[PDB]
Design an enzyme around this catalytic site. Structure first.
Site, PDB file in Angstrom:
ATOM      1  N   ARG A   1      22.975 -31.894  29.078  1.00  0.00           N
ATOM      2  CA  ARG A   1      23.367 -30.895  28.087  1.00  0.00           C
ATOM      3  C   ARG A   1      22.608 -29.612  28.370  1.00  0.00           C
ATOM      4  NH1 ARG A   1      25.957 -30.218  23.461  1.00  0.00           N
ATOM      5  NH2 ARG A   1      25.168 -28.856  21.795  1.00  0.00           N
TER       6      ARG A   1
ATOM      7  N   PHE B   1      19.670 -20.753  25.682  1.00  0.00           N
ATOM      8  CA  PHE B   1      19.084 -21.698  24.741  1.00  0.00           C
ATOM      9  C   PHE B   1      18.165 -22.690  25.447  1.00  0.00           C
ATOM     10  CE2 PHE B   1      20.278 -24.965  21.183  1.00  0.00           C
ATOM     11  CZ  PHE B   1      18.971 -24.984  20.766  1.00  0.00           C
TER      12      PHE B   1
ATOM     13  N   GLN C   1      18.626 -29.653  28.688  1.00  0.00           N
ATOM     14  CA  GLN C   1      18.230 -30.948  28.134  1.00  0.00           C
ATOM     15  C   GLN C   1      18.495 -32.088  29.103  1.00  0.00           C
ATOM     16  OE1 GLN C   1      19.252 -31.475  23.900  1.00  0.00           O
ATOM     17  NE2 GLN C   1      19.703 -33.617  24.380  1.00  0.00           N
TER      18      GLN C   1
ATOM     19  N   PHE D   1      13.762 -31.208  26.423  1.00  0.00           N
ATOM     20  CA  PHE D   1      14.415 -29.992  26.848  1.00  0.00           C
ATOM     21  C   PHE D   1      13.413 -28.944  27.276  1.00  0.00           C
ATOM     22  CE2 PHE D   1      13.844 -27.590  22.846  1.00  0.00           C
ATOM     23  CZ  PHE D   1      13.650 -28.618  21.944  1.00  0.00           C
TER      24      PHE D   1
ATOM     25  N   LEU E   1      13.034 -24.400  15.856  1.00  0.00           N
ATOM     26  CA  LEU E   1      12.723 -25.786  16.170  1.00  0.00           C
ATOM     27  C   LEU E   1      11.259 -26.134  15.871  1.00  0.00           C
ATOM     28  CD1 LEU E   1      14.750 -26.168  19.454  1.00  0.00           C
ATOM     29  CD2 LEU E   1      15.499 -26.698  17.142  1.00  0.00           C
TER      30      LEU E   1
ATOM     31  N   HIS F   1      10.677 -30.331  16.381  1.00  0.00           N
ATOM     32  CA  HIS F   1      10.572 -30.902  17.723  1.00  0.00           C
ATOM     33  C   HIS F   1       9.147 -30.752  18.204  1.00  0.00           C
ATOM     34  CE1 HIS F   1      14.915 -31.521  18.245  1.00  0.00           C
ATOM     35  NE2 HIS F   1      14.963 -30.584  17.316  1.00  0.00           N
TER      36      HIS F   1
HETATM   37  O1  1FP Z   1      22.885 -34.412  23.815  1.00  0.00           O
HETATM   38  C1  1FP Z   1      21.884 -35.014  23.453  1.00  0.00           C
HETATM   39  N1  1FP Z   1      21.501 -35.167  22.182  1.00  0.00           N
HETATM   40  C2  1FP Z   1      20.254 -35.902  21.960  1.00  0.00           C
HETATM   41  C3  1FP Z   1      19.339 -34.993  21.145  1.00  0.00           C
HETATM   42  N2  1FP Z   1      19.984 -34.649  19.861  1.00  0.00           N
HETATM   43  C4  1FP Z   1      21.262 -33.921  20.024  1.00  0.00           C
HETATM   44  C5  1FP Z   1      22.229 -34.609  21.007  1.00  0.00           C
HETATM   45  O1  1FP Z   2      17.174 -32.772  20.216  1.00  0.00           O
HETATM   46  C1  1FP Z   2      17.224 -31.752  20.893  1.00  0.00           C
HETATM   47  N1  1FP Z   2      17.887 -30.694  20.438  1.00  0.00           N
HETATM   48  C2  1FP Z   2      17.940 -29.476  21.266  1.00  0.00           C
HETATM   49  C3  1FP Z   2      17.521 -28.307  20.393  1.00  0.00           C
HETATM   50  N2  1FP Z   2      18.403 -28.252  19.219  1.00  0.00           N
HETATM   51  C4  1FP Z   2      18.243 -29.443  18.362  1.00  0.00           C
HETATM   52  C5  1FP Z   2      18.552 -30.737  19.131  1.00  0.00           C
HETATM   53  O1  1FP Z   3      20.230 -16.475  22.671  1.00  0.00           O
HETATM   54  C1  1FP Z   3      20.035 -17.242  21.728  1.00  0.00           C
HETATM   55  N1  1FP Z   3      20.989 -18.075  21.320  1.00  0.00           N
HETATM   56  C2  1FP Z   3      20.733 -18.977  20.175  1.00  0.00           C
HETATM   57  C3  1FP Z   3      21.271 -20.373  20.493  1.00  0.00           C
HETATM   58  N2  1FP Z   3      22.677 -20.273  20.910  1.00  0.00           N
HETATM   59  C4  1FP Z   3      22.765 -19.550  22.187  1.00  0.00           C
HETATM   60  C5  1FP Z   3      22.304 -18.101  22.001  1.00  0.00           C
END
Ligand code: 1FP
Ligand code: 1FP
Ligand code: 1FP
Ligand code: 1FP
Ligand code: 1FP
Length: 164
Positions: free
Chosen positions: A54, A59, A62, A112, A121, A125
């Site tokens: 992901r 942003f 991940q 991430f 966050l 986190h």
């Molecule tokens: O795509 C991964 N995820 C695990 C972390 N929480 C949001 C979804």
């Molecule tokens: O769990 C990881 N994430 C990426 C950042 N946004 C919230 C979910």
């Molecule tokens: O640049 C910051 N952002 C906030 C999260 N979504 C993508 C754009």
């Protein structure tokens, strides 16, 4: 002192280079140790061969779901999940290394790397390190993301381990 670990990353089988991470074991020793051991693979499982599943540009990138490869999986060296150790380190800018989760006290192996300051966050986190070298590699990974998080190339951690 604090461990240095590395992730060597491919996109579609082509090497992007190495990301070097400092793990802040002085602040979050349990969280740092989990990541360190998953990099070396010393417990018999870990990040080697798994993906960045992901990636959202401007942003985060991940990774760490080495069981299901889709964001649902992963596990820690302690068991399936472990508590939030503390929220002392903050999401101060690009390069921050932080634990992904599914709510409070659900840390496993997913993580991430931020490409912007993600201050919203903080307190949610657990931040446990940052990029020492290889932000260019992180920004390449970032460029292969999309608004949906789906990657446009297959991004693989081909090797990983501990430098010190
Ligand atoms: O795509 C991964 N995820 C695990 C972390 N929480 C949001 C979804
Ligand atoms: O769990 C990881 N994430 C990426 C950042 N946004 C919230 C979910
Ligand atoms: O640049 C910051 N952002 C906030 C999260 N979504 C993508 C754009
Ligand atoms: O980046 C913040 N740090 C404070 C604690 N020592 C490790 C580095
Ligand atoms: O979003 C699901 N996850 C699996 C458990 N580890 C945290 C992320």
């Amino acid at each position: 002192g604090n461990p240095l670990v590395y992730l060597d990353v491919d996109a579609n089988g082509k090497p992007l280079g190495r990301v070097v991470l400092e793990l802040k074991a002085d602040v979050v020793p349990k969280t740092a140790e989990n990541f360190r051991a998953l990099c070396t693979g010393e417990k018999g499982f870990g990040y080697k061969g798994s993906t960045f599943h992901r990636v959202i540009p401007s942003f985060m990138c991940q990774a760490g779901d080495f069981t299901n490869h889709n964001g649902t999986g992963g596990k820690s060296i302690y068991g399936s999940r472990f508590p939030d150790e503390n929220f002392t380190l903050k999401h101060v800018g690009p390069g921050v290394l932080s634990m992904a989760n599914a709510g409070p006290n659900t840390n496993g192996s997913q993580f991430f790397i931020c490409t912007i300051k993600t201050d919203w966050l903080d307190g949610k986190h657990v931040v446990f390190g940052h990029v020492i070298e290889g932000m260019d590699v992180v920004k390449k990974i970032e460029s292969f993301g999309s608004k949906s998080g789906r990657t446009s190339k297959k991004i693989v951690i081909t090797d990983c381990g501990q430098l010190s």
